Amino acid sequence: KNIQVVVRCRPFNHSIVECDPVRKEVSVRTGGLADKSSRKTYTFDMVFGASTKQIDVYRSVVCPILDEVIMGYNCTIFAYGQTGTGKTFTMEGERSPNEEYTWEEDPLAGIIPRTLHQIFEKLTDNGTEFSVKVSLLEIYNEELFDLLNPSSDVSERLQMFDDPRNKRGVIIKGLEEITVHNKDEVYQILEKGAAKRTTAATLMNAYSSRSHSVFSVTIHMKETTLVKIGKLNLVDLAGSENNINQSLLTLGRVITALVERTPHVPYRESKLTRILQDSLGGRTRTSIIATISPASLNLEETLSTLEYAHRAKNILNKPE
Amino acid sequence: KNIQVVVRCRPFNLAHSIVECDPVRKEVSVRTGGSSRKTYTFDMVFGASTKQIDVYRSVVCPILDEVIMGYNCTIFAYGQTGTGKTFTMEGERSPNEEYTWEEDPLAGIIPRTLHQIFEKLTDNGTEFSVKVSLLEIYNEELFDLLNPSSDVSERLQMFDDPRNKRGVIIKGLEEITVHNKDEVYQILEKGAAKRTTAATLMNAYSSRSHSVFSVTIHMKETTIDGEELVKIGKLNLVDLAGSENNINQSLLTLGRVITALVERTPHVPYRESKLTRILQDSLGGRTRTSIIATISPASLNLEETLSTLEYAHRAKNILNKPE
Ligand SMILES: CON(C)C(=O)N1N=C(c2cc(F)ccc2F)S[C@@]1(CCCN)c1ccccc1
Ligand SMILES: CON(C)C(=O)N1N=C(c2cc(F)ccc2F)S[C@@]1(CCCN)c1ccccc1
Ligand SMILES: Nc1ncnc2c1ncn2[C@@H]1O[C@H](COP(=O)(O)OP(=O)(O)O)[C@@H](O)[C@H]1O
Numbered sequence: 185k186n187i188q189v190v191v192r193c194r195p196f197n198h199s200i201v202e203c204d205p206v207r208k209e210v211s212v213r214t215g216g217l218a219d220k221s222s223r224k225t226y227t228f229d230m231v232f233g234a235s236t237k238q239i240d241v242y243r244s245v246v247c248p249i250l251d252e253v254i255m256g257y258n259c260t261i262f263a264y265g266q267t268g269t270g271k272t273f274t275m276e277g278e279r280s281p282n283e284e285y286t287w288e289e290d291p292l293a294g295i296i297p298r299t300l301h302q303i304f305e306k307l308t309d310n311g312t313e314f315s316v317k318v319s320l321l322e323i324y325n326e327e328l329f330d331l332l333n334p335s336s337d338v339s340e341r342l343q344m345f346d347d348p349r350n351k352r353g354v355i356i357k358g359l360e361e362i363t364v365h366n367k368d369e370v371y372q373i374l375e376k377g378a379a380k381r382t383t384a385a386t387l388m389n390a391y392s393s394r395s396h397s398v399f400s401v402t403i404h405m406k407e408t409t410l411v412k413i414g415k416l417n418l419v420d421l422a423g424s425e426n427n428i429n430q431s432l433l434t435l436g437r438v439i440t441a442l443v444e445r446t447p448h449v450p451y452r453e454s455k456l457t458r459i460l461q462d463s464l465g466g467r468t469r470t471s472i473i474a475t476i477s478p479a480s481l482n483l484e485e486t487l488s489t490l491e492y493a494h495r496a497k498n499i500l501n502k503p504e
Numbered sequence: 505k506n507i508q509v510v511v512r513c514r515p516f517n518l519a520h521s522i523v524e525c526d527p528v529r530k531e532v533s534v535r536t537g538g539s540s541r542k543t544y545t546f547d548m549v550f551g552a553s554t555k556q557i558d559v560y561r562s563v564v565c566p567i568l569d570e571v572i573m574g575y576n577c578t579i580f581a582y583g584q585t586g587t588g589k590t591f592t593m594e595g596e597r598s599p600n601e602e603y604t605w606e607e608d609p610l611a612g613i614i615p616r617t618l619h620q621i622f623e624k625l626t627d628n629g630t631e632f633s634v635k636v637s638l639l640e641i642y643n644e645e646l647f648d649l650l651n652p653s654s655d656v657s658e659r660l661q662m663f664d665d666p667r668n669k670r671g672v673i674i675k676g677l678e679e680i681t682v683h684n685k686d687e688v689y690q691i692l693e694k695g696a697a698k699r700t701t702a703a704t705l706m707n708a709y710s711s712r713s714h715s716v717f718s719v720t721i722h723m724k725e726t727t728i729d730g731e732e733l734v735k736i737g738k739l740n741l742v743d744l745a746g747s748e749n750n751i752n753q754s755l756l757t758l759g760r761v762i763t764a765l766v767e768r769t770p771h772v773p774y775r776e777s778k779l780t781r782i783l784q785d786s787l788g789g790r791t792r793t794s795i796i797a798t799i800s801p802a803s804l805n806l807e808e809t810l811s812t813l814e815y816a817h818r819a820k821n822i823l824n825k826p827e
């Protein structure tokens with residue numbers, strides 16, 4: 185199964201970006217001043233334009249993937265793109281101003297909170313007893329951080345090792361798995377993460393745009409007609425305008441090596457590609473959401489992102 | 505009137521305690537050893553079990569009563585990073601969305617203050633407007649953290665006000681109007697969000713910056729005889745930078761000023777930094793001033809807790825002459 189690549193465009197806070205969902209097409213005014221007429225076009229698996237509310241993203245991109253998680257496959261969603269184009273928005277979201285909605289209902293919620301709420305809804309009183317545990321593992325300067333561990337300072341780095349059993353596997357020493365016992369335990373658990381993020385931003389320069397975040401949901405399920413185990417990793421990558429950059433560089437070379445069928449794929453050259461090894465060229469169903477800004481001020485980065493997302497279409501995975 | 509100096513001690517985390525606070529004796533005492541200790545006396549002393557409403561009732565309500573009479577006032581939060589300065593002046597949310605913002609027991613001074621201004625001034629005769637500014641000092645550069653237009657990183661300039669002489673004018677600093685109690689939280693949300701950018705753009709912004717949150721209240725009384733009496737009250741809520749920290753110039757200049765004021769030297773170095781120049785009248789001037797020292801109960805912070813208590817204790821001897 186080829187990696188699916190979705191493009192989403194944010195609204196202005198004179199677009200050079202035109203989206204055609206039905207044609208699955210993105211169009212860019214490249215010539216600006218002299219050449220009003222030239223455009224670049226790329227085709228992707230799906231295309232969402234600037235009026236795409238969150239529920240459109242959740243219904244089309246996530247629900248299908250999460251259903252597959254509920255079967256007991258692995259799945260990953262990456263958000264890729266230039267800083268300020270909506271990666272954190274898409275994977276996490278925001279709160280409607282002035283305490284208008286509860287977190288379960290807020291139309292501005294994104295993938296992570298929308299998922300943890302519906303994991304419980306999809307699986308309650310339908311036979312299956314199940315456990316939900318989450319991890320927030322984050323990479324900065326090729327150093328590993330736990331951002332939901334409650335008895336640790338964020339600044340305590342983790343260690344990573346080869347898993348002897350697996351060969352793509354890594355073991356992270358002391359990565360905390362927090363259990364989510366019910367739907368109304370989520371937001372509380374997300375708030376503890378929110379606060380260490382703030383501490384992390386205080387400890388590390390440009391932490392929010394220079395760090396990679398892997399938010400992982402593990403579901404053990406019991407339905408004797410049978411035990412399934414599905415894992416969904418929610419990856420907020422660092423802005424694609426970037427040791428400080430090593431994971432972002434190596435994600436690049438892995439994707440290249442994979443599609444040009446190059447011999448030695450360098451998963452081991454960076455912690456991000458070691459953790460997410462099975463997501464690039466493995467037994468994981470992987471989706472990439474490329475995010476882009478509609479303003480001519482960002483022409484070169486928008487084009488950089490589209491070229492990157494498009495060359496990633498050709499990676500074959502084998503969800504097993 | 506001597507400046508009021510209170511010490512508040514935070515509780516531990518989920519991650520030995522060398523701090524014993526005695527409210528009734530208003531004494532905080534710290535184990536220098538472990539047969540050893542140092543003791544200080546303060547105007548008030550709050551222990552790790554002190555709820556926020558106790559801080560607000562004890563420390564702020566008089567201050568605010570005085571603001572409404574038409575005086576200026578400042579409340580400083582001093583202490584080393586991780587002891588509760590931002591806890592004290594802004595607060596936190598009770599977990600799991602349990603209370604609305606107006607009712608949350610974990611709200612701190614600023615949100616509680618903006619709530620009760622409207623409460624205290626409902627139907628009491630006085631007509632009034634509330635405007636707020638969030639001005640911040642970082643690396644001796646000025647920042648507006650509530651201007652809805654303009655990016656955070658757009659720096660402001662400051663000048664001597666020719667009219668006043670302690671005065672400065674800050675060019676392009678925005679005053680946002682709070683028309684009622686239910687416009688507050690929303691306005692703070694814009695603040696909360698520009699803060700997140702600021703931390704992204706500037707190294708350790710949350711601990712190396714000074715934050716001046718100012719509420720000005722224009723008041724109009726009209727007597728039994730028709731005449732209008734106009735009072736103007738201003739409250740500055742100052743979250744100072746961590747006392748363990750050019751990048752340090754305001755924090756360093758505050759120290760020299762406080763020293764200079766308490767050993768009564770003629771030359772106070774107000775204009776050696778933007779913080780002491782902005783807040784010039786709060787140190788040795790006609791402003792009623794309170795300092796809240798924050799300290800940690802852990803032996804691991806022994807050296808800084810002392811440095812803080814010693815710092816706070818010397819500010820007791822600053823005399824102000826309000827209005
Ligand atoms: C109010 O405080 N909190 C905790 C939040 O607002 N959120 N929790 C999130 C979150 C935090 C993390 F640390 C890690 C991964 C995450 F998904 S998502 C987010 C949005 C904030 C992100 N900018 C949210 C939750 C629920 C509904 C709508 C938005
Ligand atoms: C995102 O939600 N918001 C906006 C908040 O939670 N708060 N607004 C704060 C705030 C932000 C500023 F930029 C400046 C001065 C301030 F006081 S106070 C605080 C929480 C403190 C840390 N933010 C709060 C509000 C209401 C009840 C209880 C606590
Ligand atoms: N699809 C969208 N709809 C509304 N606002 C958006 C959208 N995408 C991004 N934004 C806004 O743009 C700003 C940048 O979003 P952010 O998620 O921080 O980008 P990134 O994570 O790539 O740095 C935020 O204020 C966010 O509200």
Ligand SMILES: Nc1ncnc2c1ncn2[C@@H]1O[C@H](COP(=O)(O)OP(=O)(O)O)[C@@H](O)[C@H]1O
Binds near residue numbers: 513514584585596
């Ligand atoms: N009085 C208090 N009660 C409860 N928690 C506190 C208190 N003071 C500090 N904390 C906690 O300690 C940490 C440091 O708080 P903070 O105000 O950010 O410190 P500072 O701004 O002085 O560096 C936060 O987790 C906060 O919740």
Ligand SMILES: [Mg+2]
Binds near residue numbers: 271272273392393
């Ligand atoms: Mg982001």
Ligand SMILES: [Mg+2]
Binds near residue numbers: 589590710711
């Ligand atoms: Mg702080």
